[PDB]
Structure 1
Amino acid sequence: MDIILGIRVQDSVILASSKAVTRGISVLKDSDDKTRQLSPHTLMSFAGEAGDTVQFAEYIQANIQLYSIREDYELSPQAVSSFVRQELAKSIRSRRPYQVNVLIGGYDKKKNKPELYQIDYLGTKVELPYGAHGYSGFYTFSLLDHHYRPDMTTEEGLDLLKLCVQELEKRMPMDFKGVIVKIVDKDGIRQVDDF
């Protein structure tokens, strides 16, 4: 799929992901949620080739949910991200690699800190205050480099995200049909129903 953004603020992680699914010259859907909840305080957004994306995401989701049941304990966002990276690094030298790029946004309840991880289909992991996949970052990184502070509130993060989306909507040739936005914090995961 097309655009997936992520920004870590003071006390939360915000993930914005496009709503459009496209097959050739036709928009099949304009309300697609490109994310899966791995655990109550860990959310993963994804984008890549059709099938591979959802197959991989749900495969990861099942593994993390299995771990949670077995140990009666939620893995840290760092542990989850490292698991995901290994699966992709394993994938890249396989017969048919998963063509998926992901963003993992989570709130570590032990450290009381939000965390954002960017992992591409090769298994290249990096912890960031803000990140993007594909052609998204090309338009948005200049605004984020300018406006971002680590002490930002969730509301300020959303306003900076609106600015990033507005720039995409002006300069990107492709219509991605807006974004679904989700916030990950100490109280869990919730969706911003108006954006």
Structure 2
Amino acid sequence: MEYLIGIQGPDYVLVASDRVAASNIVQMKDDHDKMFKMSEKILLLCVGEAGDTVQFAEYIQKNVQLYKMRNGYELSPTAAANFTRRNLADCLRSRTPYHVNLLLAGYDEHEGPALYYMDYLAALAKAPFAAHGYGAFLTLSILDRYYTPTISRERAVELLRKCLEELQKRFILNLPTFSVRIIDKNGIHDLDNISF
């Protein structure tokens, strides 16, 4: 059980993900990264079945980078989200479906920040905030309660923390640390891990 979260402010998208790789009753890695850089202003966050998750995300990543090399400019976040969706949907009924749940976060020069949610069935929804994993059941209502559309990034990192503190308090799984990144006009920034 893996957790992803995104929160879109006016000019930025904040994303976080747990850093655990688990197997059976053990955590096998405590500094795992569930984020994939697609381009200077796009992150794909990918969870789900082992093998499928990295294979799918890295395929998308290489194709996004290829588009940049072929054309001299990048796909927009929206175009990248639709490209991702097309591939997942096209594989749904094939001999090689990918059992993956995703967020795509991006910043476009002209359209601003965008956050997209996709499930393994390949339904795509744009959202102001979203979360995947069992931890979403405990945190989405906190986001519904405290969010606003104009939420500043200092305040957004607090809101994120409340979600993460709620997992420490109430969720049955041990998820002690989280990767945190923010995207804006100036590209992808690493923030400090949030750790307990």
Query: In structure 2, what is the equivalent of residue 156 of structure 1?
Result: 155
- The reply to whether residue 78 of structure 1 matches residue 78 of structure 2 is yes
Q: Show the 5 A alignment for 1:26-41.
A: 26-41=26-41
Q: CA deviation at 1:98?
A: 0.7
Secondary structure of the structure 2 residue equivalent to 1:46:
strand
Q: How many residues align?
A: 194
Give, in whole Å, the separation in 1 of the partners of 2:23 and 2:163: 26
Answer with 139-148 or 63-72: which moved more: 139-148
Aligned to 2:99: 99
TM-score after normalising by structure 1: 0.96
Paired residue type of 1:96:
T
Where do 5+ consecutive residues of structure 2 fail to align? Answer: none
Are 2:177 and 2:193, in contact at CA under 8 Å, matched by a contact in 1?
A: no
Distance 2:89 2:13 in 1: 25
Structure 1 residue matching 2:96: 3-state secondary structure: coil
Report the CA distance shift for 1:53/1:194 in structure 2 as closer, same or farther (over 3 A). closer
AA aligned opposite 1:172: F
Question: How far 1:136 sits from its partner (Å)?
Answer: 2.4
Distance 2:88 2:175 in 1: 26
Distance 2:98 2:63 in 1: 16
Identity %: 45
Which consecutive segments of 4 or more residues in structure 1 shift more than 4 A?
A: none
Bigger mean CA deviation after superposition, 54-63 or 170-179: 170-179
Structural RMSD (CA): 1.0
* CA deviations over 1:124-145 (Å, ceiling 9, x no partner): 1000000011222211111111
Q: TM-score, structure 2 length as denominator?
A: 0.96
Contact 2:168 2:176 in 1 (8 A): no
* Conserved? CA contact 1:16–1:180, under 8 Å: yes
Which runs of no fewer than 5 residues in structure 1 stay unpaired?
Answer: none
| Residue identity in the other structure for 1:47 | V
Helix, strand or coil for the counterpart of 2:50?
Answer: coil
The one-letter amino acid of 2:35's match is T
SS, match of residue 114 in structure 2: strand
Q: Deviations over 1:146-178 (max 9, x none)?
A: 110111111111000000101011111111232
Indicate whether 1:88 and 2:78 are aligned: no
Q: Aligned residue for 1:130?
A: 129
Q: Is the 8 A contact 1:11 1:153 kept in 2?
A: no
Alpha-carbon distance, 1:96 to partner = 3.3
**Aligned partners of 1:128, 1:171: CA distance in 2, in Å?**
25
1:20 aligns with 2:20: yes
